[PDB]
Design an enzyme around this catalytic site. Structure first.
Site, PDB file in Angstrom:
ATOM      1  N   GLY A   8       0.785  -1.223   0.000  1.00  0.00           N
ATOM      2  CA  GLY A   8       0.000   0.000   0.000  1.00  0.00           C
ATOM      3  C   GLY A   8       0.819   1.276   0.000  1.00  0.00           C
ATOM      4  O   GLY A   8       1.606   1.522   0.911  1.00  0.00           O
ATOM      5  N   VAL A  10       2.556   0.157   3.780  1.00  0.00           N
ATOM      6  CA  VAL A  10       2.378  -1.245   4.135  1.00  0.00           C
ATOM      7  C   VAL A  10       3.189  -2.085   3.161  1.00  0.00           C
ATOM      8  O   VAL A  10       3.190  -1.822   1.954  1.00  0.00           O
ATOM      9  CB  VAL A  10       0.889  -1.650   4.118  1.00  0.00           C
ATOM     10  CG1 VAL A  10       0.709  -3.081   4.611  1.00  0.00           C
ATOM     11  CG2 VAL A  10       0.076  -0.680   4.968  1.00  0.00           C
ATOM     12  N   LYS A  24       3.200  -2.541   8.612  1.00  0.00           N
ATOM     13  CA  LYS A  24       2.923  -1.118   8.456  1.00  0.00           C
ATOM     14  C   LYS A  24       4.044  -0.331   9.129  1.00  0.00           C
ATOM     15  O   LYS A  24       4.378  -0.586  10.293  1.00  0.00           O
ATOM     16  CB  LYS A  24       1.560  -0.750   9.047  1.00  0.00           C
ATOM     17  CG  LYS A  24       1.104   0.674   8.726  1.00  0.00           C
ATOM     18  CD  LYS A  24      -0.390   0.881   9.010  1.00  0.00           C
ATOM     19  CE  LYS A  24      -0.842   2.285   8.593  1.00  0.00           C
ATOM     20  NZ  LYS A  24      -2.309   2.535   8.781  1.00  0.00           N
ATOM     21  N   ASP A 112     -13.182   6.166   8.863  1.00  0.00           N
ATOM     22  CA  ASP A 112     -12.651   6.039   7.503  1.00  0.00           C
ATOM     23  C   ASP A 112     -13.282   4.861   6.759  1.00  0.00           C
ATOM     24  O   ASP A 112     -12.634   4.242   5.912  1.00  0.00           O
ATOM     25  CB  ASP A 112     -11.113   5.877   7.543  1.00  0.00           C
ATOM     26  CG  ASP A 112     -10.417   6.360   6.260  1.00  0.00           C
ATOM     27  OD1 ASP A 112     -10.986   7.166   5.492  1.00  0.00           O
ATOM     28  OD2 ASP A 112      -9.275   5.933   6.029  1.00  0.00           O
TER      29      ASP A 112
HETATM   30  C1  U8J Z   1      -6.192  -0.418   3.245  1.00  0.00           C
HETATM   31  C2  U8J Z   1      -5.119   0.681   3.212  1.00  0.00           C
HETATM   32  C3  U8J Z   1      -3.794   0.307   3.916  1.00  0.00           C
HETATM   33  N1  U8J Z   1      -3.329  -1.021   3.364  1.00  0.00           N
HETATM   34  C4  U8J Z   1      -3.402  -2.205   3.997  1.00  0.00           C
HETATM   35  C5  U8J Z   1      -2.861  -3.202   3.165  1.00  0.00           C
HETATM   36  C6  U8J Z   1      -2.768  -4.674   3.402  1.00  0.00           C
HETATM   37  N2  U8J Z   1      -2.746  -5.417   2.259  1.00  0.00           N
HETATM   38  C7  U8J Z   1      -2.707  -6.735   2.386  1.00  0.00           C
HETATM   39  N3  U8J Z   1      -2.666  -7.601   1.224  1.00  0.00           N
HETATM   40  C8  U8J Z   1      -2.607  -7.220  -0.174  1.00  0.00           C
HETATM   41  C9  U8J Z   1      -2.625  -5.895  -0.656  1.00  0.00           C
HETATM   42  C10 U8J Z   1      -2.576  -5.588  -2.031  1.00  0.00           C
HETATM   43  C11 U8J Z   1      -2.504  -6.570  -3.022  1.00  0.00           C
HETATM   44  C12 U8J Z   1      -2.468  -6.250  -4.515  1.00  0.00           C
HETATM   45  O1  U8J Z   1      -2.782  -5.125  -4.905  1.00  0.00           O
HETATM   46  N4  U8J Z   1      -2.111  -7.243  -5.514  1.00  0.00           N
HETATM   47  C13 U8J Z   1      -2.056  -7.036  -6.976  1.00  0.00           C
HETATM   48  C14 U8J Z   1      -2.491  -7.887  -2.545  1.00  0.00           C
HETATM   49  C15 U8J Z   1      -2.538  -8.199  -1.181  1.00  0.00           C
HETATM   50  N5  U8J Z   1      -2.698  -7.413   3.564  1.00  0.00           N
HETATM   51  C16 U8J Z   1      -2.742  -6.609   4.680  1.00  0.00           C
HETATM   52  N6  U8J Z   1      -2.739  -7.045   5.967  1.00  0.00           N
HETATM   53  C17 U8J Z   1      -2.778  -5.978   6.857  1.00  0.00           C
HETATM   54  C18 U8J Z   1      -2.808  -4.809   6.076  1.00  0.00           C
HETATM   55  C19 U8J Z   1      -2.778  -5.241   4.695  1.00  0.00           C
HETATM   56  C20 U8J Z   1      -2.504  -2.468   1.979  1.00  0.00           C
HETATM   57  N7  U8J Z   1      -2.783  -1.168   2.121  1.00  0.00           N
END
Ligand code: U8J
EC number: 2.7.10.2
Length: 265
Positions: A8, A10, A24, A112
């Protein structure tokens, strides 16, 4: 902890003491933001729910959470639109509601709630996935005043910067709208509101959004959205805070509608 990829900020990391987790970290590690991050970690640590991303620990400051491999509901719903029927949308809706119901029992305000903050573990389970704006209510009040994603904000959040379980319910209504438009960008809350305000306009957008909402302008019923589901959205979007439904009642209604849809009423 071995960095794998950024998600992200993250990141996806491997915790292999000679295993896949999300980490994070803080971009600008200031005193103000460190204090906020510390409280975010304690908040997430205090939450244990199937529909809330699982806290796993801290690193020296880094926040360690379970990795959810399908990413945000926005990317997931976009990629799988044609195979996500309304009964499935209501399965996600129910899980978000029950997560928010549980958050309410801690007197936490999420502040949010939007599909961007929901993550997908697998085809059958989504989780509230970011708590970066979440506040713990004070002992002496049922709201928190915080000096923004305005197109998800309740009217009193726009006018008085007041956030409450009721303003979370308003934003849930917008989440439900996002789901039943299948997060199509041309139908998104910002696109719809800007067209309704008029693309003849910064701070003025907030002024006209407030005037629009005060005059009971609302996001339209999405194409194909059953009336009962749009009715839930409009009840969440009541200008009167006291008239908005509770998350417990929303969860029960969503479950009833989902079961009626599956059974043929
Ligand atoms: C919501 C805003 C903050 N944020 C939290 C996360 C996050 N993402 C993911 N997995 C994930 C993310 C993106 C993709 C992808 O795009 N693949 C093409 C695949 C898997 N697991 C998470 N566990 C705890 C936070 C967290 C990302 N951003």
């Amino acid at each position: 902890l071995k960095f794998l990829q950024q998600l992200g900020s993250v990141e996806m990391c491997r915790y292999d003491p000679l295993e896949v987790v999300a980490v994070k970290k803080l971009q600008h590690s200031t005193e103000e933001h460190l204090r906020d991050f510390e409280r975010e970690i304690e908040i997430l640590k205090s939450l244990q729910h199937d529909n809330i991303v699982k806290y796993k620990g801290v690193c020296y400051l880094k926040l360690i959470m379970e990795y959810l491999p399908y990413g945000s509901l926005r990317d997931y719903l976009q990629k799988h639109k044609e195979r996500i029927d309304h009964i499935k949308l209501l399965q996600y809706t129910s899980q978000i509601c029950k997560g928010m119901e549980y958050l309410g029992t801690k007197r936490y305000i999420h502040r949010d709630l939007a599909t961007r903050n929901i993550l997908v573990e697998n085809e059958n389970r989504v989780k509230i996935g970011d708590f970066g704006l979440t506040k713990v209510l004070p002992q002496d009040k049922e709201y928190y005043k915080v000096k923004s994603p305005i197109f998800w904000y309740a009217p009193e959040s726009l006018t008085e910067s007041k956030f409450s379980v009721a303003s979370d319910v308003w934003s849930f209504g917008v989440v439900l709208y996002e789901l039943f438009t299948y997060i199509e960008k041309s139908k998104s809350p910002p696109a719809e509101f800007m067209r309704m305000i008029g693309n003849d306009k910064g701070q003025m957008i907030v002024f006209h959004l407030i005037e629009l909402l005060k005059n009971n302008g609302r996001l339209p019923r999405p194409d194909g959205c059953p009336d009962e589901i749009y009715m839930i959205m409009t009840e969440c979007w009541n200008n009167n805070v006291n008239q908005r439904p509770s998350f417990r009642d929303l969860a029960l209604r969503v479950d009833q509608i989902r079961d009626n849809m599956a059974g043929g009423s």
